[PDB]
Design an enzyme around this catalytic site. Structure first.
Site: not given
Ligand SMILES: [Ca+2]
Ligand SMILES: [Ca+2]
Ligand SMILES: [Ca+2]
Ligand SMILES: [Ca+2]
Ligand SMILES: [Ca+2]
Ligand SMILES: [Ca+2]
Lengths: 160, 162, 160, 160, 160, 162
Positions: C85, C90, C127
């Site tokens: 991201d 991640d 989200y």
């Molecule tokens: Ca994390």
């Protein structure tokens, strides 16, 4: 591929035993169960059928999230829980949502994990332990072909 | 005339099929397991703080409530009876309690003041909830009075202080 | 067979984004999500790890019923969701309950149905769509061995 | 812009009066309310403060979805419910989430609809109607400046 | 000031897509959604209307607390969400409770905060992303007058 | 010796601030309003089927339950008392009931068998729930016995049949 509508009376996790009065279509609270148990699947009956007990044929539907009492679900049979209790036969047709590809891997009774079938069997053996006179004489899982033949009989009983 | 009381930590709210348990060194809530039977805890369930039972954990408690609490919550409680039982790890009695200092429970002073239907459902739970767990069982379960309950609390406190 | 404790921060179905303060162990509400979305699995982190991002390694745990924020679950990895991201790399380790035979059929990433993996992916891709400054560049599922490799890296960084 | 952490003890909609024991940080059920009432907002106290009653300063936080008992929320004051009961003062600081742009339109007490302020006032006047000896001698809403001065006093009382 | 009855099919927060069978009035589970999303408002249709798509005109109702499937709510329109998907034009009328003074401040589309309108839009743009064959071409908010125009069209088509 | 019973349709489950109401021609459930006070229905709340009260609707009922039901659900019930009250639209009594045929409620035969704390909380609800609705009130509310309850049910049935 056989499919039919199931009216869900009791959502998974319920101790309140809701029933539909078939003459009126109203939802009634039959009783709060006397045992510390809860319905292991959404539970109801198959619309336009008629069984040994005087009522439409009972049905269990496997779902990712439970519904509300009175909700219709288009369903297809994958097996059946044959049970004889003190009142005679009261079989429970096991189903999955029809037309939903997330359930295509479940086609017959062998496709349902043994852990879930065992817990369903456990519920129906014991849920009326604290109501006198009730007991189960027999309880076995049978396959889709057995379910379908039993559905088709209950549909003829209804029509004629 | 002066009634015994203690603090109960509720691990499992009424209606739960998730078997939560408090770790007794850290105070953290752990999920032991999802139950194998289509059953749910008939009352809020937990343990008496600052006691030690004969399974090495604090003494088990059941608390009658008008509305359940969350896992980890404390309730000041007074004993009214006990459910004696023996499982695979031997004896494991359960003290039945009501909230202490609450006049809505004053009519409950001893095990006979609890309706039998509720006592039977509690019993049914413990007799059957591990029916589908291989090599597990619960036998010889029955209900005894406040006297036997308090005397057993007394012991477990004595065990704890040692 | 590798296993560890996961602290669940967020139960399946939540639009409240809860976080554990690692300095203290208290649960905090980080935010209510800006999108009409809900965590598709119980979500949290692995105890005594340190991710490449500086927090403990994120974990997703498949369960028959959600837990509460702060609850520990003994878990074993079966795969991992890799994402990039706005702040870079991640990873989220996908797990099932350890020592529970009802999950023995899930051993690797291929054992989780595609519908479920796609829904999880869709959550993390979208989200944060209404939080300005966020984006996702890529998102991919990798298998158990790559998951276990990252758990080890993160264990070694905790000890460091 | 003043901001602080609020520990929520009681989620909106609760009849169970949870409290934190401040010596231990444990959540306790103080009582099930004797009236058929429920907390109109998430309710708790401000960390690192000290008030007239012996306890930290009480707080009300407006949220789109309630949290769980024990959860921290970074908050900013927009007003305060000054109340004197039989035990003396026990004011309640009204807050919104800090740093959340969905609440930027609420800056002072005039920005909170009268309907919600009236219902909050109604709760605190009546919730102990069925507990003898309790009553409210005064109850008024006051503005953000009043709240902040009262917070800053309670913070000094705590420190010294 | 135009008002009508809305039957709510789906409460806010649901991933089960319930529908009313218009031939019968029974609630049916159409499907469990394929995305990790939940209806951002109570959702349903306006009684005695007929939309350009052949079903009653869809409606969204802002509420302080959700209702149950099948519940009637007297509502008044404040705007409308216009969308074009794979099957063409589809409109959803945004409403608040009629005759309730707590909603008198909401008279037109500009009175609903942007965060809420964006979240509603985001739901309908994305909720069918994992159903193959679906897409959305455009999605826009229009004001109360255009909403009221479409309600009238749909009333006239019902009578036809 | 043979106890009166009837069917109650529950409109509002215990714990609700949404005031649901059944339409008496169609059988549909409507949301009347969200309550204006931070209050919730202290029991499951509804009406007795096939009766007509002096407000033109069926006679109001309260049913004591171990777990609430949903809006629209029927429960076979027997009366144990009544809450007399007068609001803006005049008299509007509420019959207190328990499930019929259920031995767990056999200890409740008349209004004195219901704990006072529960009777007071029910009363508190009706006295105060419309406190913040302009031009609404509830006055003169108190509890009467099974006899007065049954005789009033009897009337309302007579009204209905006409
Ligand atoms: Ca994390
Ligand atoms: Ca049957
Ligand atoms: Ca034990
Ligand atoms: Ca205080
Ligand atoms: Ca439509
Ligand atoms: Ca009435």
């Amino acid at each position: 591929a056989m499919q039919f509508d199931v009216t869900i009376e009791i959502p998974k996790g319920q101790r309140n035993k809701y029933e539909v009065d078939h003459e009126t279509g109203r939802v009634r609270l039959d009783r709060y169960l006397y045992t510390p148990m809860a319905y292991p699947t959404d539970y109801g009956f198959i619309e336009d059928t008629l069984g040994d007990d005087g009522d439409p044929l009972d049905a269990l539907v496997l779902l990712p999230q439970p519904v509300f009492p009175g909700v219709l679900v288009a369903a297809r049979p994958v097996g059946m829980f044959r049970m004889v209790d003190e009142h005679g036969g009261d079989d429970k047709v096991l189903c999955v949502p029809a037309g939903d590809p997330r359930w295509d891997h479940v086609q017959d009774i062998g496709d349902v994990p043994a852990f879930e079938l065992d817990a369903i069997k456990h519920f129906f053996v014991h849920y009326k332990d604290l109501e006198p006179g009730k007991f189960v004489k027999a309880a076995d899982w049978v396959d889709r072909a057995e379910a379908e033949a039993e559905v088709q009989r209950s549909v003829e009983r209804f029509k004629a």
